[PDB]
Design a protein around this ligand. Structure first.
Ligand SMILES: Nc1nc2c(ncn2[C@@H]2O[C@H](COP(=O)(O)OP(=O)(O)OP(=O)(O)O)[C@@H](O)[C@H]2O)c(=O)[nH]1
Ligand SMILES: CNCCCOc1cc(F)c(-c2c(Cl)nc3ncnn3c2N[C@@H](C)C(F)(F)F)c(F)c1
Ligand SMILES: Nc1ncnc2c1ncn2[C@@H]1O[C@H](COP(=O)(O)OP(=O)(O)CP(=O)(O)O)[C@@H](O)[C@H]1O
Ligand SMILES: Nc1nc2c(ncn2[C@@H]2O[C@H](COP(=O)(O)OP(=O)(O)O)[C@@H](O)[C@H]2O)c(=O)[nH]1
Ligand SMILES: [Ca+2]
Ligand SMILES: [Ca+2]
Ligand SMILES: [Ca+2]
Ligand SMILES: [Ca+2]
Ligand SMILES: [Mg+2]
Ligand SMILES: [Mg+2]
Lengths: 418, 438, 54, 351
């Protein structure tokens, strides 16, 4: 009754999105046919936040799957839960984007966008009171990057008073499978800076090191990387999906986490005793973005504990980490660490701890991308492929300046005193 | 007999109101279905408990209360709870999206859309009143609705009911159970806007309530139900004089004349004792002089402050149960010899005392133990300004950087209202100093 | 220590114990501030939809 | 480990306690307004006491007692003594004093006693003082009340008039004046610890009762002896005589000891002063706890009677003694609340 509309764009967005629905469907006891087969009834008290309810008590995800090529859309339909989605919500083209942000944003994605907004509008109109949107996508490709931010912009025009959240896979510091990723990511960041309320930054190199070093998967795959993300997306959305009152809707969470409108890029974390969890959740090696928190200060933090646990012990150890490392929390935002607890644990574990941090250390990620981008743009390398789709150079100059401005802002607040 | 209407605004206001009204029903013998066997005037009456309860021809007793929130999850519990039949749906008002811990959103954006239906539903209650005393307004400082919408309604109530009195029961923000980081903002803004419309406000810092429940009830992690049940006791002991025969505080006007010589300084400190755990099969009972002496220990106050470093302007002692005046004055004289109790030069050093022979009523299954004498003291001491100093300092640290201000400007409020509200608290902190300091 | 103004009834008693003697906006104004707040919001939405139209 | 904050950088005593706590390896210093501290070494004026004890999960301690100002300033101390039954306007160890305001004011009562003793031709030399005067200035000594009542209206801050001790004990050689300084530590349990080591702060010129003009012969402040007379430093280093030397002088020159002749009265005055305020400043039931180090200033007359002249709430130690005292502060007042990892220098005054 405070509904959210989920959108997934491009290959990465759709594969991450697909398994996010696997995780939470199991948590709410929904089976691939859409029928509920659970034990408790807190699985359904807030089910309508992510599921439309239908005929004969079958719950359909309020999800819209978007890509410019049908391939990855076919695997989703072939997957374990491929059958649970409303078939009218598969909006796909045939041309693809060629790893080109311009194609996704301006030419190929332009032809397909109105069809997506048609589906979005139909979903939103069946919402007692729409809350906001969440998008999953990568920033290094063409569709989720170029078209994904086009959808965001069109969505904000029809729904300017609604919250726009994203889970955004960013370029990684050392690994890359495409040459023009800096152009795609920088252009998309400029969009997110302006048109999202909360973005969770994920990169595959950090996702991978957890899989290999921690979970000891000797040969990790995108499938393993995506299960980590999906488990984290379940964690960060626990308070939206189960009865609580800390960060219960998208707006309240944004009011508590975003002190300044542009600094809305978050570092997620996940773990795995009560003193054990709270130590891990704060460790560098549990962040899904490749930024070290001890290189900056937290402006705000949102910790979420799941399972049966002494809330007394949790409260006590949360305070011990804050007071133990007081130097890493801005002194001009009092009580900026909020903790929530949910009794529903994730499957496989019994006590989870998901971490959402708004640290100025995130500037390191925007500086990596900015250094890569300038190295190419100073020589205009590969630029003709973008101006050939109709773009102007200043559109790159503006994108570079804005992310560089974003970096100075993070540092301006990284040094502020009381 | 003059009637009082209670208005519960926001989540805290609603959930506290529902504990109070449950507690009123037990004290008066009213059952969940509104039937009061003890009431012999069927379908009417001029009794003192009628100040809070209406009556229908069918013999039901209906609280003179209105519950309002900007989202329906909380008020729905009232529509579904033990005491659902008590209220007619007209008294329960729901928006659909709340104020998102944003004062400006609850006061300006959403408040304007709903303020007027709320006033109609209030007027529906006032129309049933032969002479209406005024309003008791339960709300929180930190919520978006509790701070934003409450201040809007107070402004309107000062117009639709210009002469009637308004009392607040405010929940002051405490980080150990707080929901939002911007609660200092919402607290300063609603206090500034409400100050000149409240005749007397009883603040309850959730920190104090939280630590009492931990110390004296052995609750390792107090919940809202634990806090509200303790709160409703202190509330009930304050409103008892309006619901029972007596000659002290029988009128919302008396609360101000007895406790507030200065309009702006209308925040009396409440101290309550004894709070004893019901898990103790028995607790060797306490004296009048001991519970009375406990009224001057900061660990029993609703707001942690040091009255020793301020001055009193008024003090009221509200006893419940086996108490007689001679034992009270014995406790007072002996207590004045061992305590630091300095009144202002321009006021008499004295205590107004009220006694109600009915011992405190407890909720079955609660953590509070049935006692045979309890006392609540209401003292207007300048030491309560410590709570303003704490809030103002937190407000200052965040506002120096304009942290979170964009959320309020985005709702149509001007940055100036921040400075304006803070300057008002700066004046109030200083007026408290001219009074209670040399 | 005087004990003045003692009153008694079946439900209890009251009295006072001296120890030592001594030594708003118009309704129209309200609306005009809520309308100026609604206008500021509408101006902000307008400048956003203008820039999105660009 | 524990955390503390420094809010009076101008504190010799708490500067070195801060240095001591960091040498601990168990204490970390944050900066002024980081509120997540265990210990506050706070400022001297308008210390925000209302913001302490409200940080969840943190036992917080502060090195000042709220309300001790009523004892640690002149106008305050006079009214406290005269209006507190435990201390009695008839108090014997406090020189007859009167609060007087320039331009609740005992100017009419002071002249009553003034003429009462010129009627008896007794000594009528009085002194006026206040807590605006520093660097040894603001104070005047005379025998004509008119000279001191005109001099106080020449000011604008409230001063106190007090009978000058015309017959003080004079050290020989020298025939010089002196005052004694006792440092006392009050922990969070309100235990009153007296430092075993005091100091006699000296005058280096013979005591001339004939003229009070030269206030190097009368005002024993370390200020005016270092800076306006050249025999500062002759008899003892820095005009500071310590107890073991003063004890030998008393035995050798008067057949008595420091303990019997002076120290018993000192301990009695300390107890009386701090126990009269315990109800109003104690923090044993408070959401934060307090300690504080005080400096008591005493004068000794020729009959070996001790008199209190003032109490200092923000005192400085003597350079030879900073190490010993400042660590006693740590073990008794700080590590008492915050234990570390694992004889005495104080005299505990019972009560
Ligand atoms: N004692 C007590 N405090 C409460 C209760 N509910 C909320 N609070 C406190 O009130 C503050 C949160 O404000 P709420 O009243 O929940 O918010 P609201 O009035 O519903 O306004 P919005 O939800 O923002 O629209 C926090 O400081 C909580 O600690 C309650 O039932 N009892
Ligand atoms: C010590 N720090 C080392 C961190 C190693 O970081 C990573 C991240 C990944 F996301 C992958 C990965 C995975 Cl897991 N599955 C895949 N399926 C198809 N491609 N692909 C992947 N990457 C493509 C580019 C490649 F194989 F060409 F390299 C990977 F191998 C290493
Ligand atoms: N009633 C009195 N009789 C005799 N001598 C007196 C006196 N009052 C003060 N004095 C002397 O005058 C000196 C200055 O007085 P006082 O102690 O109050 O100044 P002060 O406040 O600067 C000391 P500190 O620097 O330690 O705070 C004292 O050292 C004392 O020797
Ligand atoms: N975690 C994850 N990342 C992916 C996956 N597929 C592609 N990516 C990432 O996204 C980039 C390729 O973008 P892609 O989604 O294929 O482009 P698009 O389909 O046009 O939006 C590379 O940087 C990959 O690291 C996936 O299945 N899981
Ligand atoms: Ca085409
Ligand atoms: Ca169309
Ligand atoms: Ca009746
Ligand atoms: Ca009025
Ligand atoms: Mg609410
Ligand atoms: Mg002095």
């Amino acid at each position: 009754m405070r509904e959210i509309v989920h959108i997934q764009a491009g290959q990465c967005g759709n594969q991450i999105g697909a398994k996010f629905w696997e995780v939470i469907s199991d948590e709410h006891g929904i089976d691939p046919t859409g029928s509920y087969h659970g034990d408790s009834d807190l699985q359904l008290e807030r089910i309508n936040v992510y599921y439309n309810e239908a005929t004969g008590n079958k719950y359909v995800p309020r999800a819209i799957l978007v890509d410019l090529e049908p391939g990855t859309m076919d695997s989703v339909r072939s997957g374990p839960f491929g059958q649970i989605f409303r078939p009218d919500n598969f909006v796909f083209g045939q041309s693809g984007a060629g790893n080109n942000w311009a194609k996704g944003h301006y030419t190929e994605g332009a032809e397909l966008v109105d069809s997506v907004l048609d589906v979005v509008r139909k979903e939103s109109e069946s919402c007692d009171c729409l809350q906001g949107f969440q998008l999953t996508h990568s920033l290094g490709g063409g569709t989720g990057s170029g078209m994904g931010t086009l959808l965001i912009s069109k969505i904000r025009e029809e729904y300017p008073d609604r919250i726009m959240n994203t889970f955004s896979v960013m370029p990684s510091p050392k690994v890359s499978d495409t040459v023009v990723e800096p152009y795609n990511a920088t252009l998309s960041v400029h969009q997110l800076v302006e048109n999202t309320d909360e973005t969770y930054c994920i990169d595959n190199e950090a996702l991978y090191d957890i899989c290999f070093r921690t979970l000891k998967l000797t040969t990790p795959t995108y499938g393993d990387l995506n299960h980590l993300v999906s488990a984290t997306m379940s964690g960060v959305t626990t308070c939206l999906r189960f009865p609580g009152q800390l960060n219960a809707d998208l707006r309240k969470l944004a009011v508590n986490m975003v002190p300044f409108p542009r600094l809305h890029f978050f570092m997620p974390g996940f773990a795995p005793t009560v003193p054990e969890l709270t130590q891990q959740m704060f460790d560098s090696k549990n962040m899904m973005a490749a930024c070290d928190p001890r290189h900056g200060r937290y402006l705000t933090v949102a910790a979420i504990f799941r399972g049966r646990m002494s809330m007394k012990e949790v409260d006590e150890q949360m305070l011990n980490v804050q007071n133990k490392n007081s130097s890493y929390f801005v002194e001009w935002i009092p009580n900026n660490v909020k903790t929530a607890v949910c009794d529903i644990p994730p499957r496989g574990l019994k006590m989870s701890a998901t971490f959402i941090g708004n640290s100025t250390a995130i500037q390191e990620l925007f500086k990596r991308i900015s250094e890569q981008f300038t190295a190419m743009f100073r020589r205009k390398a590969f630029l003709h492929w973008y101006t050939g789709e109709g773009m102007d150079e200043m559109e790159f100059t503006e994108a570079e300046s804005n992310m560089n401005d974003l970096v100075s802002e993070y540092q301006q607040y990284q040094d502020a005193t009381a | 007999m003059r009637e009082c209407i209670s208005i519960h605004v926001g989540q805290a206001g609603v959930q506290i109101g529902n504990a109070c009204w449950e507690l009123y029903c037990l004290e008066h013998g009213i059952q969940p279905d509104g039937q009061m066997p003890s009431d012999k005037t069927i379908g009417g009456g001029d009794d003192s408990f009628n100040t809070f309860f209406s009556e229908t021809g069918a013999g039901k007793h209906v609280p003179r209360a209105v519950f309002v929130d900007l989202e329906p999850t909380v008020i729905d519990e009232v529509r579904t709870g033990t005491y659902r039949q008590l209220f007619h749906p007209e008294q329960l008002i729901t928006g659909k999206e709340d104020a998102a811990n944003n004062y400006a959103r609850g006061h300006y954006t959403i408040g304007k859309e709903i303020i007027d239906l709320v006033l109609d539903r209030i007027r529906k209650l006032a129309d049933q009143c032969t002479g209406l005393q005024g309003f008791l307004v339960f709300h929180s400082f930190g919520g978006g609705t509790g701070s934003g919408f409450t201040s809007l309604l107070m402004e309107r109530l000062s117009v639709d009911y210009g002469k009637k009195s308004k009392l607040e029961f405010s929940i002051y923000p405490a980080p150990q159970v707080s929901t939002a980081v911007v609660e200092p903002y919402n607290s300063i803004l609603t206090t500034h806007t409400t100050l000149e419309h409240s005749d007397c406000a009883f603040m309850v810092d959730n920190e104090a309530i939280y630590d009492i429940c931990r110390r004296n009830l052995d609750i390792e992690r107090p919940t809202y139900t634990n806090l509200n049940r303790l709160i409703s006791q202190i509330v009930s002991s304050i409103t008892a004089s309006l619901r029972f025969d007596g000659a002290l505080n029988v009128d919302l006007t008396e609360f101000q004349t007895n406790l507030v010589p200065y309009p702006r300084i209308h925040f009396p400190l409440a101290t309550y004792a004894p709070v004893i755990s019901a898990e103790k099969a028995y607790h060797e009972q306490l004296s009048v002089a001991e519970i009375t002496n406990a009224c001057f220990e900061p660990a029993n106050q609703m707001v942690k402050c040091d009255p020793r470093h301020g001055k009193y302007m008024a003090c009221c002692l509200l006893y419940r149960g086996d108490v007689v005046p001679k034992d009270v004055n014995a406790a007072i004289a002996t207590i004045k010899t061992k305590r630091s109790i300095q009144f202002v030069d321009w006021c008499p050093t004295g205590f107004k005392v009220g006694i109600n022979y009915q011992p405190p009523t407890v909720v079955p299954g609660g953590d509070l133990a049935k006692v045979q004498r309890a006392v609540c003291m209401l003292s207007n001491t300048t030491a309560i300004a410590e709570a303003w100093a704490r809030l103002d300092h937190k407000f200052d640290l965040m506002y120096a950087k304009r942290a979170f201000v964009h959320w309020y400007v985005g709702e149509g409020m001007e940055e100036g209202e921040f400075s304006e509200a803070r300057e008002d608290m700066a004046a109030l902190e200083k007026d408290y100093e001219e009074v209670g300091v040399d | 220590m005087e004990v003045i103004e003692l009153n008694k009834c079946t439900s209890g008693q009251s009295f006072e114990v001296i120890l030592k003697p001594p030594s708003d906006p118009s309704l129209e104004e309200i609306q005009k501030k809520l309308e100026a707040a609604e206008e500021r919001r509408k101006y902000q939405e307008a400048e956003l939809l203008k820039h999105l139209a660009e | 480990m524990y955390t503390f904050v420094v809010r009076d950088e101008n504190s010799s005593v708490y500067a070195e306690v801060s240095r001591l706590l960091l040498a601990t390896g168990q204490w970390k210093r944050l900066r002024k307004d980081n509120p997540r501290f265990n210990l506050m070494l706070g400022e001297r004026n308008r210390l925000p006491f209302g913001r302490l004890g409200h940080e969840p999960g943190l036992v917080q301690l502060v090195n000042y007692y709220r309300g001790a100002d009523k004892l640690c300033r002149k106008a305050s101390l006079v009214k406290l003594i005269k209006t507190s039954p435990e201390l009695s306007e008839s108090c014997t160890w406090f020189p007859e004093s009167y609060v007087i305001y320039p331009t609740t004011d005992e100017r009419e009562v002071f002249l009553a006693a003034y003429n009462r003793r010129r009627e008896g031709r007794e000594g009528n030399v009085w002194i006026a003082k206040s807590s605006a005067g520093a660097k040894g200035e603001g104070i005047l000594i005379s025998s004509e009340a008119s000279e001191l009542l005109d001099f106080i209206d020449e000011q604008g801050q409230v001063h106190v008039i007090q009978k000058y001790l015309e017959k003080p004990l004079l050290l020989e050689p020298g025939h010089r004046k002196f005052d004694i300084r006792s440092w006392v530590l009050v922990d969070h349990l309100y235990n009153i610890y007296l430092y075993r080591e005091g100091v006699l702060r000296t005058s280096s010129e013979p005591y001339n009762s004939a003229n009070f003009q030269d206030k190097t012969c009368h005002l024993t402040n370390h200020c005016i002896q270092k800076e306006y007379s050249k025999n500062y430093g002759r008899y003892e280093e820095g005009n500071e005589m310590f107890f073991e030397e003063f004890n030998q002088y008393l035995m050798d020159a008067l057949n008595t000891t420091l303990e019997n002749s002076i120290l018993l009265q000192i301990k009695h005055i300390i107890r009386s002063c701090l126990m009269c305020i315990e109800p109003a400043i104690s923090t044993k039931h408070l959401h934060y706890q307090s300690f504080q180090l005080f400096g008591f200033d005493f004068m000794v007359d020729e009959e070996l009677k001790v008199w209190l002249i003032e109490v200092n709430g923000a005192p400085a130690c003597a350079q030879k003694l900073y190490a010993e005292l400042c660590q006693g502060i740590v073990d008794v007042a700080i590590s008492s609340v915050f234990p570390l990892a694992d004889t005495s220098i104080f005299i505990k005054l019972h009560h």
